[PDB]
Amino acid sequence: LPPAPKYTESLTLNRLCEIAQAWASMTWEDIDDKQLRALLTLSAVLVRKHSKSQLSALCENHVRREALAQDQASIVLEVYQKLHSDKGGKFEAALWQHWDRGSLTLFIHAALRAGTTIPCESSAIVVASIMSLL
Amino acid sequence: SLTLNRLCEIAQAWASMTWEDIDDKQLRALLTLSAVLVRKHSKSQLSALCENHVRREALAQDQASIVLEVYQKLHSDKGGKFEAALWQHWDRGSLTLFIHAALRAGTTIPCESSAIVVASIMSLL
């Protein structure tokens, strides 16, 4: 336990969140693959900003807003876990090249909706503690 | 509830205000806010926080290691264990300055070290 110390436009966490939420609330009926590829990277990073305790939370926000069968519910949770653990973009890259690009679009979009919408902290006493600052 | 976005709006609102008139109740909540916010950054960016924290505080490199240690131990923390130890062990002033610098640095460093990931995400602004 260590002693106390003795005496334009960057991608801050705040801006990551504003981008993710801005795009999550849009309709994507005109995006090219460059925008989708970037949305994929945004969504993988956004997942990694959540604690893994909350991984399940994202998934089952995702399952409910998209009305998925246990078939895809299982797959969705595994994808969130493989993105949360992803190193060097290996799994992300596999997703981009191998998944059907339209189902990958639906997944990316629902992932941005879940990341900007679930609580980032499960413990209610931490939630109340932080929210007392107003 | 406490989404990532509102966690950030809170941390940014408080980092940019002056705490010359806050009680220990507000400070204790602020320490918790900064531990959560540190945990939102990837572990590779810990050093970035450290260097911002040192440079904005005009701290000797002597202290840099100590500062980085605190960041890592806040980043590791489960059950608020280390957070609690820190709170009761450090004096109010050292703790105020560190928490405040942590809210400035946490809301302002890039959250991603890779320039290609950064350019890709920033193509959507």
Side-chain angles (χ1 to χ4, degrees):
Chain A
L1 174 34
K6 293 306 152 194
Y7 288 63
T8 278
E9 280 196 335
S10 38
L11 183 61
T12 60
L13 201 293
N14 298 242
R15 174 155 302 166
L16 181 91
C17 289
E18 294 173 326
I19 297 170
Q21 165 141 70
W23 278 86
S25 83
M26 304 180 76
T27 309
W28 302 355
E29 79 289 325
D30 227 312
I31 58 165
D32 51 357
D33 274 13
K34 297 183 178 182
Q35 278 166 331
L36 195 68
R37 192 61 183 85
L39 287 155
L40 171 60
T41 309
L42 169 58
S43 74
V45 168
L46 178 58
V47 168
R48 276 191 298 284
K49 295 321 201 260
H50 284 279
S51 38
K52 82 172 29 174
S53 324
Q54 287 304 96
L55 275 200
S56 49
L58 299 151
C59 179
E60 315 96 27
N61 182 273
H62 185 125
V63 174
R64 169 188 79 257
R65 295 182 52 58
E66 298 298 302
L68 299 196
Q70 317 173 28
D71 191 8
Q72 313 275 339
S74 160
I75 290 192
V76 169
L77 160 69
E78 189 170 329
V79 174
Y80 276 115
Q81 310 170 323
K82 287 190 176 152
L83 289 171
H84 191 268
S85 80
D86 196 14
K87 298 294 181 178
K90 293 160 44 194
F91 184 68
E92 173 184 332
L95 282 179
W96 176 257
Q97 183 185 7
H98 304 320
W99 272 22
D100 183 82
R101 186 143 305 165
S103 65
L104 185 75
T105 298
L106 280 165
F107 182 99
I108 293 160
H109 210 334
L112 296 176
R113 299 193 196 95
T116 69
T117 280
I118 67 147
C120 57
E121 279 296 309
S122 44
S123 194
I125 46 183
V126 201
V127 170
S129 185
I130 293 183
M131 206 137 278
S132 50
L133 308 165
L134 192 81
Chain B
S1 194
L2 183 62
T3 64
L4 246 186
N5 304 77
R6 176 161 33 238
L7 180 90
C8 286
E9 296 167 325
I10 297 170
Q12 157 151 310
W14 279 88
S16 83
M17 55 181 75
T18 42
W19 302 351
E20 78 286 51
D21 195 9
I22 61 99
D23 50 352
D24 278 19
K25 304 187 179 257
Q26 275 165 332
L27 196 67
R28 184 21 181 191
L30 284 153
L31 169 56
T32 309
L33 171 59
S34 73
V36 168
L37 180 59
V38 167
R39 273 187 296 280
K40 298 319 193 261
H41 284 279
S42 38
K43 171 120 209 312
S44 74
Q45 285 301 96
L46 276 198
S47 53
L49 295 157
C50 181
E51 292 174 1
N52 185 280
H53 187 125
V54 176
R55 168 184 160 82
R56 99 160 51 245
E57 290 292 301
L59 293 191
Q61 270 38 46
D62 286 334
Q63 310 290 305
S65 56
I66 285 66
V67 173
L68 166 70
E69 182 175 327
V70 173
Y71 277 118
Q72 307 171 322
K73 287 194 174 154
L74 292 172
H75 194 267
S76 315
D77 203 16
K78 304 342 211 163
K81 219 163 77 44
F82 179 70
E83 173 184 331
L86 220 46
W87 164 260
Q88 91 154 346
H89 275 346
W90 282 17
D91 57 288
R92 181 186 320 218
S94 293
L95 190 74
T96 299
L97 283 168
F98 194 106
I99 294 159
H100 212 145
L103 296 179
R104 283 139 168 196
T107 67
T108 205
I109 66 149
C111 55
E112 279 298 314
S113 40
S114 189
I116 286 190
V117 180
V118 167
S120 185
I121 292 183
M122 292 290 280
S123 50
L124 312 165
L125 247 188

PDB file of all heavy atoms in Angstrom, chain A residues 99-115:
ATOM      1  N   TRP A  99     -19.088 -13.623 -41.373  1.00  0.00           N
ATOM      2  CA  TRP A  99     -20.522 -13.539 -41.159  1.00  0.00           C
ATOM      3  C   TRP A  99     -21.244 -12.922 -42.344  1.00  0.00           C
ATOM      4  O   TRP A  99     -20.687 -12.123 -43.106  1.00  0.00           O
ATOM      5  CB  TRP A  99     -20.852 -12.705 -39.931  1.00  0.00           C
ATOM      6  CG  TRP A  99     -20.880 -13.495 -38.704  1.00  0.00           C
ATOM      7  CD1 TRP A  99     -20.280 -14.688 -38.487  1.00  0.00           C
ATOM      8  CD2 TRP A  99     -21.640 -13.203 -37.533  1.00  0.00           C
ATOM      9  NE1 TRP A  99     -20.570 -15.137 -37.229  1.00  0.00           N
ATOM     10  CE2 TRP A  99     -21.408 -14.242 -36.620  1.00  0.00           C
ATOM     11  CE3 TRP A  99     -22.481 -12.148 -37.161  1.00  0.00           C
ATOM     12  CZ2 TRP A  99     -21.978 -14.262 -35.348  1.00  0.00           C
ATOM     13  CZ3 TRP A  99     -23.052 -12.167 -35.891  1.00  0.00           C
ATOM     14  CH2 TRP A  99     -22.792 -13.213 -35.002  1.00  0.00           C
ATOM     15  N   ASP A 100     -22.512 -13.298 -42.481  1.00  0.00           N
ATOM     16  CA  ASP A 100     -23.374 -12.612 -43.426  1.00  0.00           C
ATOM     17  C   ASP A 100     -23.372 -11.128 -43.068  1.00  0.00           C
ATOM     18  O   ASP A 100     -23.619 -10.758 -41.916  1.00  0.00           O
ATOM     19  CB  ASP A 100     -24.786 -13.192 -43.334  1.00  0.00           C
ATOM     20  CG  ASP A 100     -25.747 -12.575 -44.337  1.00  0.00           C
ATOM     21  OD1 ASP A 100     -25.752 -13.008 -45.509  1.00  0.00           O
ATOM     22  OD2 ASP A 100     -26.525 -11.680 -43.952  1.00  0.00           O
ATOM     23  N   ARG A 101     -23.101 -10.273 -44.050  1.00  0.00           N
ATOM     24  CA  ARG A 101     -22.870  -8.870 -43.694  1.00  0.00           C
ATOM     25  C   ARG A 101     -24.134  -8.203 -43.136  1.00  0.00           C
ATOM     26  O   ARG A 101     -24.025  -7.293 -42.308  1.00  0.00           O
ATOM     27  CB  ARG A 101     -22.235  -8.124 -44.873  1.00  0.00           C
ATOM     28  CG  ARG A 101     -21.816  -6.691 -44.571  1.00  0.00           C
ATOM     29  CD  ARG A 101     -20.505  -6.306 -45.293  1.00  0.00           C
ATOM     30  NE  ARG A 101     -19.397  -7.227 -45.012  1.00  0.00           N
ATOM     31  CZ  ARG A 101     -18.273  -7.293 -45.718  1.00  0.00           C
ATOM     32  NH1 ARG A 101     -18.106  -6.510 -46.772  1.00  0.00           N
ATOM     33  NH2 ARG A 101     -17.326  -8.162 -45.383  1.00  0.00           N
ATOM     34  N   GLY A 102     -25.324  -8.681 -43.496  1.00  0.00           N
ATOM     35  CA  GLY A 102     -26.567  -8.100 -43.010  1.00  0.00           C
ATOM     36  C   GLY A 102     -26.891  -8.502 -41.578  1.00  0.00           C
ATOM     37  O   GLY A 102     -27.304  -7.664 -40.768  1.00  0.00           O
ATOM     38  N   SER A 103     -26.725  -9.781 -41.241  1.00  0.00           N
ATOM     39  CA  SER A 103     -26.864 -10.174 -39.841  1.00  0.00           C
ATOM     40  C   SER A 103     -25.791  -9.511 -38.981  1.00  0.00           C
ATOM     41  O   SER A 103     -26.051  -9.165 -37.821  1.00  0.00           O
ATOM     42  CB  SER A 103     -26.848 -11.702 -39.705  1.00  0.00           C
ATOM     43  OG  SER A 103     -25.607 -12.244 -40.093  1.00  0.00           O
ATOM     44  N   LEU A 104     -24.590  -9.306 -39.529  1.00  0.00           N
ATOM     45  CA  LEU A 104     -23.560  -8.595 -38.775  1.00  0.00           C
ATOM     46  C   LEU A 104     -23.952  -7.136 -38.565  1.00  0.00           C
ATOM     47  O   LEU A 104     -23.706  -6.577 -37.496  1.00  0.00           O
ATOM     48  CB  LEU A 104     -22.202  -8.679 -39.476  1.00  0.00           C
ATOM     49  CG  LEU A 104     -21.106  -8.041 -38.602  1.00  0.00           C
ATOM     50  CD1 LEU A 104     -20.741  -8.947 -37.450  1.00  0.00           C
ATOM     51  CD2 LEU A 104     -19.859  -7.629 -39.393  1.00  0.00           C
ATOM     52  N   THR A 105     -24.589  -6.517 -39.563  1.00  0.00           N
ATOM     53  CA  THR A 105     -25.155  -5.183 -39.385  1.00  0.00           C
ATOM     54  C   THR A 105     -26.147  -5.147 -38.219  1.00  0.00           C
ATOM     55  O   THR A 105     -26.073  -4.263 -37.351  1.00  0.00           O
ATOM     56  CB  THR A 105     -25.848  -4.744 -40.671  1.00  0.00           C
ATOM     57  OG1 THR A 105     -24.897  -4.676 -41.744  1.00  0.00           O
ATOM     58  CG2 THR A 105     -26.525  -3.401 -40.476  1.00  0.00           C
ATOM     59  N   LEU A 106     -27.100  -6.094 -38.195  1.00  0.00           N
ATOM     60  CA  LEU A 106     -28.088  -6.122 -37.111  1.00  0.00           C
ATOM     61  C   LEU A 106     -27.422  -6.296 -35.752  1.00  0.00           C
ATOM     62  O   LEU A 106     -27.826  -5.673 -34.754  1.00  0.00           O
ATOM     63  CB  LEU A 106     -29.092  -7.249 -37.346  1.00  0.00           C
ATOM     64  CG  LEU A 106     -30.231  -7.002 -38.335  1.00  0.00           C
ATOM     65  CD1 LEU A 106     -30.867  -8.325 -38.691  1.00  0.00           C
ATOM     66  CD2 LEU A 106     -31.263  -6.109 -37.694  1.00  0.00           C
ATOM     67  N   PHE A 107     -26.415  -7.164 -35.689  1.00  0.00           N
ATOM     68  CA  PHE A 107     -25.718  -7.388 -34.433  1.00  0.00           C
ATOM     69  C   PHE A 107     -24.979  -6.138 -33.977  1.00  0.00           C
ATOM     70  O   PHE A 107     -25.055  -5.762 -32.801  1.00  0.00           O
ATOM     71  CB  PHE A 107     -24.743  -8.548 -34.572  1.00  0.00           C
ATOM     72  CG  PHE A 107     -24.032  -8.856 -33.301  1.00  0.00           C
ATOM     73  CD1 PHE A 107     -24.461  -9.897 -32.475  1.00  0.00           C
ATOM     74  CD2 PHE A 107     -22.962  -8.063 -32.892  1.00  0.00           C
ATOM     75  CE1 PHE A 107     -23.806 -10.154 -31.275  1.00  0.00           C
ATOM     76  CE2 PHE A 107     -22.306  -8.312 -31.703  1.00  0.00           C
ATOM     77  CZ  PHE A 107     -22.727  -9.349 -30.887  1.00  0.00           C
ATOM     78  N   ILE A 108     -24.240  -5.494 -34.890  1.00  0.00           N
ATOM     79  CA  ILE A 108     -23.498  -4.288 -34.533  1.00  0.00           C
ATOM     80  C   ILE A 108     -24.451  -3.243 -33.978  1.00  0.00           C
ATOM     81  O   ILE A 108     -24.214  -2.665 -32.907  1.00  0.00           O
ATOM     82  CB  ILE A 108     -22.723  -3.737 -35.744  1.00  0.00           C
ATOM     83  CG1 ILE A 108     -21.601  -4.685 -36.165  1.00  0.00           C
ATOM     84  CG2 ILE A 108     -22.142  -2.325 -35.425  1.00  0.00           C
ATOM     85  CD1 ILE A 108     -21.135  -4.459 -37.598  1.00  0.00           C
ATOM     86  N   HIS A 109     -25.572  -3.028 -34.671  1.00  0.00           N
ATOM     87  CA  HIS A 109     -26.505  -1.990 -34.245  1.00  0.00           C
ATOM     88  C   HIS A 109     -27.063  -2.289 -32.858  1.00  0.00           C
ATOM     89  O   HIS A 109     -27.031  -1.434 -31.960  1.00  0.00           O
ATOM     90  CB  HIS A 109     -27.626  -1.858 -35.275  1.00  0.00           C
ATOM     91  CG  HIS A 109     -28.201  -0.480 -35.386  1.00  0.00           C
ATOM     92  ND1 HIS A 109     -28.180   0.427 -34.343  1.00  0.00           N
ATOM     93  CD2 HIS A 109     -28.840   0.134 -36.411  1.00  0.00           C
ATOM     94  CE1 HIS A 109     -28.774   1.544 -34.726  1.00  0.00           C
ATOM     95  NE2 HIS A 109     -29.179   1.394 -35.976  1.00  0.00           N
ATOM     96  N   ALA A 110     -27.521  -3.520 -32.643  1.00  0.00           N
ATOM     97  CA  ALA A 110     -28.059  -3.858 -31.330  1.00  0.00           C
ATOM     98  C   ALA A 110     -26.990  -3.781 -30.253  1.00  0.00           C
ATOM     99  O   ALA A 110     -27.298  -3.493 -29.090  1.00  0.00           O
ATOM    100  CB  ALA A 110     -28.682  -5.248 -31.364  1.00  0.00           C
ATOM    101  N   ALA A 111     -25.731  -4.033 -30.620  1.00  0.00           N
ATOM    102  CA  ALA A 111     -24.647  -3.935 -29.645  1.00  0.00           C
ATOM    103  C   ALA A 111     -24.414  -2.491 -29.231  1.00  0.00           C
ATOM    104  O   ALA A 111     -24.221  -2.210 -28.045  1.00  0.00           O
ATOM    105  CB  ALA A 111     -23.362  -4.546 -30.207  1.00  0.00           C
ATOM    106  N   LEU A 112     -24.470  -1.554 -30.181  1.00  0.00           N
ATOM    107  CA  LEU A 112     -24.373  -0.144 -29.801  1.00  0.00           C
ATOM    108  C   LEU A 112     -25.562   0.282 -28.946  1.00  0.00           C
ATOM    109  O   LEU A 112     -25.410   1.087 -28.020  1.00  0.00           O
ATOM    110  CB  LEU A 112     -24.264   0.755 -31.039  1.00  0.00           C
ATOM    111  CG  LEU A 112     -23.032   0.608 -31.939  1.00  0.00           C
ATOM    112  CD1 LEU A 112     -23.123   1.512 -33.171  1.00  0.00           C
ATOM    113  CD2 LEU A 112     -21.763   0.886 -31.159  1.00  0.00           C
ATOM    114  N   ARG A 113     -26.762  -0.230 -29.246  1.00  0.00           N
ATOM    115  CA  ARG A 113     -27.910   0.123 -28.414  1.00  0.00           C
ATOM    116  C   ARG A 113     -27.745  -0.427 -27.007  1.00  0.00           C
ATOM    117  O   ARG A 113     -28.159   0.200 -26.038  1.00  0.00           O
ATOM    118  CB  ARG A 113     -29.222  -0.374 -29.026  1.00  0.00           C
ATOM    119  CG  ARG A 113     -29.577   0.194 -30.409  1.00  0.00           C
ATOM    120  CD  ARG A 113     -31.036  -0.137 -30.749  1.00  0.00           C
ATOM    121  NE  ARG A 113     -31.376   0.022 -32.163  1.00  0.00           N
ATOM    122  CZ  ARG A 113     -31.352  -0.975 -33.056  1.00  0.00           C
ATOM    123  NH1 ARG A 113     -31.012  -2.225 -32.689  1.00  0.00           N
ATOM    124  NH2 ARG A 113     -31.671  -0.729 -34.324  1.00  0.00           N
ATOM    125  N   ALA A 114     -27.209  -1.624 -26.872  1.00  0.00           N
ATOM    126  CA  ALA A 114     -27.077  -2.189 -25.536  1.00  0.00           C
ATOM    127  C   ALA A 114     -25.947  -1.533 -24.748  1.00  0.00           C
ATOM    128  O   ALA A 114     -26.059  -1.361 -23.528  1.00  0.00           O
ATOM    129  CB  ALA A 114     -26.858  -3.697 -25.623  1.00  0.00           C
ATOM    130  N   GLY A 115     -24.849  -1.178 -25.423  1.00  0.00           N
ATOM    131  CA  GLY A 115     -23.697  -0.629 -24.719  1.00  0.00           C
ATOM    132  C   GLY A 115     -23.971   0.745 -24.146  1.00  0.00           C
ATOM    133  O   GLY A 115     -23.511   1.075 -23.051  1.00  0.00           O
TER     134      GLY A 115
END
